[PDB]
Amino acid sequence: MVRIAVAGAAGRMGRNLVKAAHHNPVAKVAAGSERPESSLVGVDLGELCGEGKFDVVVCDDLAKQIDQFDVIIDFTAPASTLNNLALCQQYGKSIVIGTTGFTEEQREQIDLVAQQVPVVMAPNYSVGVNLVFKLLEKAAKVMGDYCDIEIVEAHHRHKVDAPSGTAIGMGEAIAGAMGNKLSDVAVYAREGITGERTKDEIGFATIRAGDIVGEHTAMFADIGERVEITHKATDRMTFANGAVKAAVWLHEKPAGFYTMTDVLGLNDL
Amino acid sequence: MVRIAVAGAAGRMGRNLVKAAHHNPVAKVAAGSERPESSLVGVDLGELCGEGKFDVVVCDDLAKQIDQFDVIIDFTAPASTLNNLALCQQYGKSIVIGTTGFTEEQREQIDLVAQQVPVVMAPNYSVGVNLVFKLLEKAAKVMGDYCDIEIVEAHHRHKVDAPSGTAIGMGEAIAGAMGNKLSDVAVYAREGITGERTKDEIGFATIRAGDIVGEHTAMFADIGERVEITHKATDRMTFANGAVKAAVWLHEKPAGFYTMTDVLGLNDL
Amino acid sequence: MVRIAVAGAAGRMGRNLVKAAHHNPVAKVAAGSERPESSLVGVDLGELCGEGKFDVVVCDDLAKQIDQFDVIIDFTAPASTLNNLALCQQYGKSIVIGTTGFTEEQREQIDLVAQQVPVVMAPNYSVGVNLVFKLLEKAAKVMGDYCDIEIVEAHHRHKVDAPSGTAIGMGEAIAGAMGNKLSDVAVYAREGITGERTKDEIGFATIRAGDIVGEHTAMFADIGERVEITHKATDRMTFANGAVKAAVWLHEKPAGFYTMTDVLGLNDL
Amino acid sequence: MVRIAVAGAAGRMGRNLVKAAHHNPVAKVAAGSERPESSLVGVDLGELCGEGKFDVVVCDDLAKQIDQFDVIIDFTAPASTLNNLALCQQYGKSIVIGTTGFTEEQREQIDLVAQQVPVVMAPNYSVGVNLVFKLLEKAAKVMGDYCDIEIVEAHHRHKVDAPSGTAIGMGEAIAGAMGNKLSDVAVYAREGITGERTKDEIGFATIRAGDIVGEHTAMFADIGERVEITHKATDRMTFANGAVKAAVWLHEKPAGFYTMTDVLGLNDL
Numbered sequence A, B, C, D: 001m002v003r004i005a006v007a008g009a010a011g012r013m014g015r016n017l018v019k020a021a022h023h024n025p026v027a028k029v030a031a032g033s034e035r036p037e038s039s040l041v042g043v044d045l046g047e048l049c050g051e052g053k054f055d056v057v058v059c060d061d062l063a064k065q066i067d068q069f070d071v072i073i074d075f076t077a078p079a080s081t082l083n084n085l086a087l088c089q090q091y092g093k094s095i096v097i098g099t100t101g102f103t104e105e106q107r108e109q110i111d112l113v114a115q116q117v118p119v120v121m122a123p124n125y126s127v128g129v130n131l132v133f134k135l136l137e138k139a140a141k142v143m144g145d146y147c148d149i150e151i152v153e154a155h156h157r158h159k160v161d162a163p164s165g166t167a168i169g170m171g172e173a174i175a176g177a178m179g180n181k182l183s184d185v186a187v188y189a190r191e192g193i194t195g196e197r198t199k200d201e202i203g204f205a206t207i208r209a210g211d212i213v214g215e216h217t218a219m220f221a222d223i224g225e226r227v228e229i230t231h232k233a234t235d236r237m238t239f240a241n242g243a244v245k246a247a248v249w250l251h252e253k254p255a256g257f258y259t260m261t262d263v264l265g266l267n268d269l
């Protein structure tokens, strides 16, 4: 039984993490924070995610609930996450970090603290996408040399960056497995007279529409046949499920910097 | 009896056009060109498509065979097609144009010449795509105002123009049905920080891979749901049989700009 | 002001219908049922969807709340729906029916009752599917005689009936537009040595997996090409908003069998 | 130099095998069969595939040409393939089997004869499908326990067996990687009231349409996400080149049951 503290439990990710920890039978929702000024401080965590009463409340500082949790799941903001890390060090807790947008200096501090603390830190927690990165590697080794490699992704209308960071992550897994640098081979746009396709290029096609949570397809195309590997994200919940999966696994692990690769056992397939 | 000249008879399309005209008894394979630089000049057209001798040869200039043909079928390159148009004007011939990748100025020239010459011009000669144009119009009247409209197309690695003339044809059908001009709303590339999607934009995504004969998808995406209309082309014969069908039909006709909509009687769908 | 009773309010649809009626300003959530043996009987309707308190409870029989509602919205199970229909007849109420999986005998009954009662019945309450039924008709007239017609649908793991009522709806639209009866041509299972496909058959393929809200594809396949018309449902709110929109529209109306085509004004597309 | 007999050389596969053996410089087209009642009996094999005369004819019985060949390539029908296996046993020949749709009893016979005869048997001779079998094993270990697993396949209108042997091959790879037997968990048809999906079932959906060379998708579906691994076959030459490559490889080998996984050296991927 793993006792989970959800940092910023009112956030978009937070609320999903609470719901996800609730649904995992090996995990217990034990604690939850929000910003001190927030009025959700005091509210029961189950009522927050629309799922009945848990007998736990949102606190304004996880420090205050240290003794009731084993592992912190933290998808908040850089400064907050660094304070939660420091708590782990001090009180012998573990942390699953989902927060992004750290400075280089701050990323260096995490690496240091991860020598004393069990830390999971990943740029994506989807079980399916990480499984897909591995499968792409296998496919690239077998077919990459002689196939045309295309990456196509669809997202909702509000997404401001193209292509997706997950698409770029698929490119890198492929390029790396083939001993290449993605920036050497990547083609992001095709407009007008492009000429004949190059042999080594990895082409990116980007769709922006509706409320699409996230679709990714990597295509390996040969004359005569093609292999398509596709991930569909249906619910921002899936990331939360993965992060909880990671917290369970991280429980009673030694100190170290761990990734989803490690959690899912991708290296030993 | 309709006497057909196949422009660039050695091309991917050209060879299929020859074979298609051969299979239609209302049509006679009468003439065939290639680039002057080519050594195929003097070779027999039937031997070229692997179907026995025809007693017709590939000339380097269709000008030299003007009395042997009624209609030119032209799936080559923009400059070549413009020359063949000029021949039609001067010698009272007809043309079926399949070539894509024209500049707007060049499309304006074709509109002009089509006042004097019977011209069939379509970005796609397949029944299914032309049906699809009509369906897109319906979908656009119902959903187009409040949906995000995305066009995605995949072709084989040798295609030199992006996006496909068929994709542009889908955009025009949709825009026109909504009382808009495609050029106002179209977005052909999405790279880096694009910002939030605009409401009226039609996005184009272009895949180049393998031996793909042709895939098109038009997407109407609302929050909560989407409608996808997809065409898949399996065989270049689909295009070639259509283009020959169009040539036979064009023989009877007066000057004008015609489409496969016209040929197939699909206008009042 | 239209007073809505939501049948089976605890269900996947029921809860979304409650939320949808709540958000529609012309409609009021007035009543709600669940199965008699259920312990949700007595709970406040707003609390079930985490919507706050409504001052309305889940009854075990809509008969008990008859004076509080004008229209029943019913997405439950066949026998339950027939009982609610009976209520409508006896007390001069209207019904919007979403339930699928009725026997032919039962559908004949609904047609009979709909002579005395205002009834909306559709297999799908989304705009996109109802648009799609119209597009299918067009596609069937043009391609249906040459093409092989296949209908493939995916739904979540809990759906109890196959194939979907929406798929059957697509089959009927197609068959009817081609002057056939669906039951003559439909093929619902393919196992073992089936032989060569017949020419007129409409094939049904059913996928059951995960949390899939609903995917439908009608395929028109010819040698050399195919046309695929696809609907993807992303959120049950698409259905629920439509069904509520249908209830509001039904309030004004006399006895009769209506469809979403009627509600949305799509009959003469 | 490996002397190849092509069984049923007139068939869709047979003709492509002839063409493929012709193009492979280590192999020679030595012999070829058709059904005795067939009028292609007597015709030269080269003329059949449209690439000139070979000085080899289509016999009505490979028994008659036994001294001219080392290996039989057999993509015909179950009874025919069993006779050719019997011929291999009697005269010390090898066989590459592509035929699908064997009964359980007949597959046991092939296993027995493969103790005395060098046999390659695979449901798909493509590189991409065999790679896919490996990728499915990976996905099945990571996601198979908690996901719904669905297999969907599309083929041309002439295919006589359902589901595809390749789909059954994907099921077995998945089941086997999860320590299960496919026959325990497979569900081939879903019609009417099926109830809620069981957890462990592998669902098979079969599409028969047009000229589809071959599409396969294996779906791993969890609540919130899914992973889709898809193979598309565009040209029968993919199969034929592989089968010939298998025949060349089989020439050196002793008695045994081999697969493409063996031929391609993919077992440790």
Ligand SMILES: NC(=O)c1ccc[n+]([C@@H]2O[C@H](COP(=O)([O-])OP(=O)(O)OC[C@H]3O[C@@H](n4cnc5c(N)ncnc54)[C@H](O)[C@@H]3O)[C@@H](O)[C@H]2O)c1
Binding pocket: A007, A008, A009, A010, A011, A012, A013, A014, A033, A034, A035, A036, A060, A075, A076, A077, A080, A098, A099, A100, A101, A122, A123, A124, A125, A126, A239
């Ligand atoms: N696939 C993924 O791995 C994935 C998916 C979504 C988001 N993210 C990451 O998660 C982070 C935030 O997620 P979001 O934008 O959906 O949620 P959000 O920004 O809406 O919520 C952030 C929450 O953190 C809380 N917070 C901030 N300071 C705090 C403090 N001192 N104490 C307690 N709580 C505090 C906020 O009050 C808020 O509730 C981002 O860095 C983002 O990069 C990752």
Ligand SMILES: NC(=O)c1ccc[n+]([C@@H]2O[C@H](COP(=O)([O-])OP(=O)(O)OC[C@H]3O[C@@H](n4cnc5c(N)ncnc54)[C@H](O)[C@@H]3O)[C@@H](O)[C@H]2O)c1
Binding pocket: B007, B008, B009, B010, B011, B012, B013, B014, B033, B034, B035, B036, B075, B076, B077, B080, B097, B098, B099, B100, B101, B122, B123, B124, B125, B126, B161, B239
């Ligand atoms: N509208 C349609 O339905 C349709 C279908 C298929 C292809 N296309 C388009 O048609 C064009 C041809 O495509 P392809 O894939 O067959 O290309 P391809 O390059 O195989 O064929 C082009 C041929 O045209 C020839 N050519 C060029 N200039 C010439 C000249 N002056 N005289 C004679 N021949 C000349 C070339 O020598 C070559 O043989 C492309 O623009 C493509 O986009 C259109």
Ligand SMILES: NC(=O)c1ccc[n+]([C@@H]2O[C@H](COP(=O)([O-])OP(=O)(O)OC[C@H]3O[C@@H](n4cnc5c(N)ncnc54)[C@H](O)[C@@H]3O)[C@@H](O)[C@H]2O)c1
Binding pocket: C007, C008, C009, C010, C011, C012, C013, C014, C033, C034, C035, C036, C075, C076, C077, C080, C097, C098, C099, C100, C101, C122, C123, C124, C125, C126, C161, C165, C239
């Ligand atoms: N037309 C559409 O747009 C559409 C959309 C979704 C679902 N459906 C159909 O609607 C029906 C229900 O779907 P669901 O996924 O929401 O199922 P569900 O099981 O989640 O919900 C059905 C609810 O009805 C309740 N119920 C059963 N018997 C009852 C009774 N006698 N009195 C009161 N309540 C009772 C159940 O207890 C349950 O809460 C199905 O038949 C489905 O095929 C139609």
Ligand SMILES: NC(=O)c1ccc[n+]([C@@H]2O[C@H](COP(=O)([O-])OP(=O)(O)OC[C@H]3O[C@@H](n4cnc5c(N)ncnc54)[C@H](O)[C@@H]3O)[C@@H](O)[C@H]2O)c1
Binding pocket: D007, D008, D009, D010, D011, D012, D013, D014, D033, D034, D035, D036, D075, D076, D077, D079, D080, D097, D098, D099, D100, D101, D122, D123, D124, D125, D126, D239
């Ligand atoms: N394993 C694979 O990679 C793969 C790939 C494609 C097709 N197939 C399978 O291979 C088989 C052949 O498919 P197809 O599309 O080529 O079928 P087809 O009907 O086109 O060809 C079968 C041929 O075998 C011939 N034949 C039948 N009985 C014979 C006999 N007793 N002696 C000699 N010839 C005989 C037929 O006359 C015919 O020409 C099918 O079972 C199909 O599922 C397997």
Ligand SMILES: O=C(O)c1ccc(C(=O)O)o1
Binding pocket: B021, B022, B023, B024, B027, B028, B029, B030, B046, B053, B054, B055
């Ligand atoms: O137009 C033809 O079909 C054509 C022209 C010439 C021949 C032939 O030699 O068979 O066929």
Ligand SMILES: O=C(O)c1ccc(C(=O)O)o1
Binding pocket: B100, B123, B124, B155, B159, B160, B163, B164, B165, B166, B167, B213, B214
């Ligand atoms: O629509 C097109 O542009 C189109 C259709 C077909 C091709 C091609 O094969 O290059 O290009």
Ligand SMILES: O=C(O)c1ccc(C(=O)O)o1
Binding pocket: C100, C123, C124, C155, C159, C160, C163, C164, C165, C166, C167, C213, C214
């Ligand atoms: O058309 C249907 O039957 C349909 C649409 C949605 C559902 C469901 O969720 O069960 O069923």
Ligand SMILES: O=C(O)c1ccc(C(=O)O)o1
Binding pocket: D100, D123, D124, D155, D159, D160, D163, D164, D165, D166, D167, D213, D214
């Ligand atoms: O896996 C198969 O059964 C298979 C693969 C290809 C075909 C066919 O073309 O009939 O059948």
